[PDB]
Amino acid sequence: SGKSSKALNEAAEQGDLAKVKNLVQKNKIDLNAQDETGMTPLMNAAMGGNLDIVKFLLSKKVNLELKNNGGETALAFAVTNDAYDVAEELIKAGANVDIIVAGDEGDTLFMRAAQNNKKTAESILAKNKSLINKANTLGETALFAVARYGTPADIDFLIKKGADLKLKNKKGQTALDVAKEASNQDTAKALSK
């Protein structure tokens, strides 16, 4: 690849659209070139939650699927930094939704969205409905967190989207089992029906 630019990456993160545009108009920077930590302009724009910049960079046909050294794409940055407007735009542009977000548990993009933003969780499932049942590194899906700590309405949401109650985590437990362990009688009753 060609030259990367610290000034561009910083302007993208900080949200300075005029500066991004002035730097890109020179056609001297390879917009897909990765810096020393694997970061691109798009990852910086997404991490900083800068929709206008992200839209501009998408108009230049940047690669959506480059990963930084932590293994995250621009979409994972958007979701983990609560930039759900950016996440939506990236999903629309065809960004891969079947990815893992950074952290010890290896949660799926879907699991992180399901905890934080229902609309993005639905956008993800519209792309690949089987992600509802894709487990993290402990063998748990989104249903397990709700079984422990959530409410019967949350159980209903995930079951309506196809959550499979029979799935077992790496300890051999179902969502019903973890509800019972957590003394969550309401979710246990909802899972039992």
Numbering used by the authors: 26 to 218
Please quote the paper that reports this structure:
Here we show that Bdellovibrio bacteriovorus utilizes a small ankyrin repeat protein, Bd3460, to protect itself from endopeptidase activities during entry of prey. We demonstrate that endopeptidase complexation by Bd3460 prevents cell wall decrosslinking, and that both the Bd0816 and Bd3459 targets bind this self-protection protein via a common epitope. Previously, we assigned prey cell rounding to the action of two secreted Bdellovibrio peptidoglycan DD-endopeptidases, Bd0816 and Bd3459, that act to modify the invaded cell wall via hydrolysis of the structural 3-4 peptide crosslinks. In summary, we conclude that we have identified and characterized the first ever self-protection protein encoded by predatory bacteria—ankyrin repeat protein Bd3460 from Bdellovibrio inhibits the prey wall decrosslinking enzymes Bd3459/Bd0816 and in doing so protects the predator from the shape transition that this catalyses in prey.
The structure is comprised of six sequential ankyrin repeats (AR1–AR6), which stack together to form the conventional ‘cupped hand' fold representative of ARPs, with the short β-strand ‘fingers' projecting out from the concave ‘palm'. The repeat regions largely conform to the 33 amino acid length of regular ARP motifs, with the longest loop present between AR3 and AR4 (sequence representation in Supplementary Fig. 7). The region surrounding the AR3:AR4 loop at the ‘centre' of Bd3460 displays three major deviations from the ankyrin structural consensus. Firstly amino acids V126 to G131 form an extended loop that differs from the usual tight turn present between the fingers of the other repeats of Bd3460/standard ARPs. Thirdly, the repeats of Bd3460 can be grouped such that AR1:4 and AR5:6 stack with a regular angular periodicity, but AR5 is twisted with respect to AR4. This 4+2 arrangement of repeats results in a partial cleft between these two subdomains, lined by D132, M136, A139, Q140, A167, A170 and V171. The cumulative effect of the three deviations from consensus structure is that the central AR3:AR4 loop projects further from the core of Bd3460 than the other loops, and at a relatively more acute angle. Bd3460 displays conformational sampling such that chains A to E adopt different relative flexation between AR4 and AR5.
